[PDB]
Amino acid sequence: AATADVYDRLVDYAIAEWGECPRPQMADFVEQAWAARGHRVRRVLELCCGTGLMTEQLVRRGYEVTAVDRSETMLALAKQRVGGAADFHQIELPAPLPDGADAVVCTAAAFNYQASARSLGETLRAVATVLPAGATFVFDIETAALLKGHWGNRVWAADEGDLAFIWDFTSEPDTTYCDVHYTQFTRHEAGADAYTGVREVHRLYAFDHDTVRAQARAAGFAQAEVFDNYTERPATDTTRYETWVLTRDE
Amino acid sequence: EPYAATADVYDRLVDYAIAEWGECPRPQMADFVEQAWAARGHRVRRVLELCCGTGLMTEQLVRRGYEVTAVDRSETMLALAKQRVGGAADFHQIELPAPLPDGADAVVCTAAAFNYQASARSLGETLRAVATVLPAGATFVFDIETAALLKGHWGNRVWAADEGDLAFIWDFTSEPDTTYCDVHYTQFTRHEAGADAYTGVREVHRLYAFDHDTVRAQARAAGFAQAEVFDNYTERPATDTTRYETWVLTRDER
Ligand SMILES: Nc1ncnc2c1ncn2[C@@H]1O[C@H](CSCC[C@H](N)C(=O)O)[C@@H](O)[C@H]1O
Ligand SMILES: Nc1ncnc2c1ncn2[C@@H]1O[C@H](CSCC[C@H](N)C(=O)O)[C@@H](O)[C@H]1O
Numbered sequence: 312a313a314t315a316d317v318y319d320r321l322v323d324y325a326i327a328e329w330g331e332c333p334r335p336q337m338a339d340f341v342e343q344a345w346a347a348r349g350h351r352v353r354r355v356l357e358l359c360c361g362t363g364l365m366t367e368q369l370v371r372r373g374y375e376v377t378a379v380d381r382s383e384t385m386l387a388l389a390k391q392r393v394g395g396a397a398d399f400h401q402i403e404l405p406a407p408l409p410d411g412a413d414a415v416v417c418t419a420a421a422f423n424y425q426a427s428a429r430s431l432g433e434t435l436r437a438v439a440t441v442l443p444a445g446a447t448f449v450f451d452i453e454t455a456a457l458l459k460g461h462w463g464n465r466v467w468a469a470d471e472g473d474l475a476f477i478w479d480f481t482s483e484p485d486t487t488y489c490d491v492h493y494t495q496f497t498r499h500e501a502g503a504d505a506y507t508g509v510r511e512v513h514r515l516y517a518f519d520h521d522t523v524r525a526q527a528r529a530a531g532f533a534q535a536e537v538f539d540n541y542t543e544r545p546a547t548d549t550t551r552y553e554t555w556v557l558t559r560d561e
Numbered sequence: 562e563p564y565a566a567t568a569d570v571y572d573r574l575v576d577y578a579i580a581e582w583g584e585c586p587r588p589q590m591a592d593f594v595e596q597a598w599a600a601r602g603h604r605v606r607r608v609l610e611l612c613c614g615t616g617l618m619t620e621q622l623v624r625r626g627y628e629v630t631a632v633d634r635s636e637t638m639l640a641l642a643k644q645r646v647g648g649a650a651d652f653h654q655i656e657l658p659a660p661l662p663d664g665a666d667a668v669v670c671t672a673a674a675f676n677y678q679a680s681a682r683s684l685g686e687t688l689r690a691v692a693t694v695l696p697a698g699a700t701f702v703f704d705i706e707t708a709a710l711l712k713g714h715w716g717n718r719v720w721a722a723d724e725g726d727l728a729f730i731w732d733f734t735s736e737p738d739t740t741y742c743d744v745h746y747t748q749f750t751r752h753e754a755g756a757d758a759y760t761g762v763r764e765v766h767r768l769y770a771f772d773h774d775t776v777r778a779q780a781r782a783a784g785f786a787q788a789e790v791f792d793n794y795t796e797r798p799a800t801d802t803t804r805y806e807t808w809v810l811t812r813d814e815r
Contacts, residue, residue, distance in 0.1 A: 468721035468730045470747040470763070475730065477721045494723040496749050496759060506749055506759040510723070 312384040313497055313509075315392055317474060318362045322419075324469060324476075329457070330551055332541045337418055338368035340541035341449050344556055345414060350447055356412035358404060358438070358450075359421035363389025363397075369416075370396050377409050405433035410441040417450035420552070423458070423515045428522050435530035435557070444561040448532065449554065451541070455517040457551035458482070458489045473498040475506075488516045520546075523555065532557040568641050570727060570750065571615045575672075577722060577729075582715075583804055585704075585794045590671050591621035593794040594702045597809055598667060601700065609665035609694065611657065611687075611703070612674030616642025616650075622669075623649045630662050658686035663694045670703035673805070676711070676768045681775050688783035692812055701785065701810040704794070708770040710804040711735065711742040726751040728759075742768045773799075776808065785810035 325331040345352045353375055360366050360378035362385060369376045370393045380386050381403035390399055400409060404421075415438050425431045438448050459482050467478040475496045482489040491513050499505040518526075520537065527535045538544060540552040578584035598605045606628055613619045613631035619642050622629045629650040633639050639652045653662060668691050678684040691701050716735040722728065732745035744766050749759040773790065780788050791798055793805040 466719070466721050468719050468732075470730050470732065470745065475747060475749070475761070477723050477728065477730070479721075479723065492723065494728060496728070496761060498761070504761050506761045508728070508749065508751070508757045508759045 312382070312388075313495075315362045315388045317495070317497065318388070319364070320471065320474060321476065322364065324467075328467060329461070330540070331419075332451075332552060334364045334368050334418070337365060337451075337541050338372060340538075340554065341414075341416055342372065344449060345447065348447065348556075348558075350414060350445075352413045354412045354414075356409060356415045356441070358408075358415065358417035358434075359419070360389050360399070361385050361419065363392040365416065365418045366397055367393050377412060379408070405430060405437050408437050408441045412441065413443070414446055415442060415448045417448075420451055420453045420515075422450055422452045423517070424513060425516060425518075426514075427516075428518065428526055431518060431523075432526035432530050435527055435532060439531035439559060442559045444559055446559050448557040448559070450557075451552055451554045452518060452523075453515065453552055454546075454550055455487065455519070456549055458515050458517050461551065462489060462491075473501070487518075488514050490514050527555075527557050531560045533560050534558040562644070564641055564644055568615050568645060570748070571641070572617075573724065573727060574729070575617065577720075581720060582710075583793065584672070585805065587617045587621050587671070590618060590704075590794050591625060593791075593807065594667070594669055594700075595625070597700060597702060601698075603666065603698075603700065605666040607665045607667075609662065609668045611661075611668065611670035611691070612672075613642050613652075614638050614672065614674075616645045618669065618671045619650055620646050630665060632657075632661070658683060658690050661690050661694045665694060665699075667699055668695060668701040670701075673704060673706045673768075675703055675705045676770070677766070679767070679769060681771060681779055684771065684776075685779035685783055688780055688785060688810075692784035695812040697812055697814040699812045701812070702807065703810075704805055704807045705771065705776075706768065707799075707803055707806055708740075708772070709802060711768050711770045712737070714804065715742060726754065740770050742770075744768060780808075780810055784813045786813050787811040 326333055355369050355374045355376050357366055357378040360380045366376055366378045366389055376397040378397055379400045379402045383401055386399045386401060462480040463482045465480055477494040479492040480489055493511040495509045496506040524535050536556040537546045538554045539546050539550045541554050546553050579586055608622050608627045608629050610619055610629060610631045613633050615638060619629055619631045623646045631650050632653045632655040634656040636654055643652050712735050715733040718733055720731040728749045730747040734743040746764040748762045752758045777788055789809040791807040792803045794807050799806045
């Protein structure tokens, strides 16, 4: 992997080009969601923390954050971003999760990497086991309108001098997913033309509302509220990023 | 040679333009001009090619048996073009507009080289230099990209491809009040297969669009009163939606 600057500039690109929600607004929404529903939240468990952009917001707002991610490299960058002011663990979902938290969050569409509705339901079960009755789990997912409709088979690319990258999307009409080929070139030194090339490839899956509710209900979240990209707006046909608020059974 | 791979990169960029942008393959370009010469009864033997680049059109003309004189402002391109055709052509380094070699039966200039003329006067001067070395009734065929391409399709879009050993980015910028398109090109080439070490190279230039009335007026003032314009080396005439225009100019009498 590379520096937090690279991943931060990819997030910058997603915000400007595709409408991804900035992390300060994300945390504003989850805090308002907790307040409006009267939840007492002091300890927060964050799934798939990455470089810790949401972890920085949660820590800055005074919460006792526990953050997990399957990459030791991501956990290293996140610990540096927040100065170690959170307990980090290395876990890959679905798997047993830490306990003792009042609320759980999972931002930046990590759930779109889940292969099947089964793997989705398994992750929700992993969260439900470590959630007290009546407590909340907030995550986001990208919709088919974004994966198939907007990204589709188009290409995005940017040359920022020290960093250049290519997003290559492929989408079949008869599927619920799309494949992303990511290519990245980072400059060695400012006074040279040497670059390191790195590539990643992932399949991004879409889950319709009927599936999300069935898996949440089966996992112990009979109550599920969905909103349009960290606002009070309801999700509609043109919604690209859905924010789900799940409430543990009692 | 540091050329078979250098021409390879250029060739792949042409492959991309053909597959993604509708640029015409060179064999079809040569089919078009040969049909133009035959319809006019021109027994063409000596062909003058302007802005030959890496020589893709040069190779088509050499293979079809013509005596080719090819010009370009870059000695790098001329070296690549000379290698591609095995030296079976006469290569001249000329920065157009400037005096041209005399004696050709026909003149061609393919793949939107005239979109690099930064003004209509300079375009007209290049046409005037062609007219100086053509007899009455001889033909000049060139193609240009249109405003529908430069200001409409490309305009303000990005195109990129990762082909493994080669990756490139085309960044076009276009303002409505100008007649041109800014081009930022970025390129990465791998040193040897197996390692992730790449060489990064960039390049910036402008592409200019000319409406029909300007081209016809400049061609007429340069001694080409009669001009036919077609859609990208087909028999269909140019329309508002045409992206690549093929102009067929006839040198005036006397
Ligand atoms: N099943 C899984 N379990 C744990 N981490 C996962 C995972 N799938 C993806 N990840 C990790 O989640 C991260 C992508 S999301 C990171 C951005 C962060 N959520 C934010 O708000 O900015 C990556 O580090 C990836 O390795
Ligand atoms: N004013 C000018 N005088 C001479 N060569 C020029 C020129 N403007 C551009 N060129 C040349 O035109 C070429 C780009 S266009 C060449 C494409 C080629 N005919 C083909 O069929 O594929 C470059 O080699 C460039 O050096």
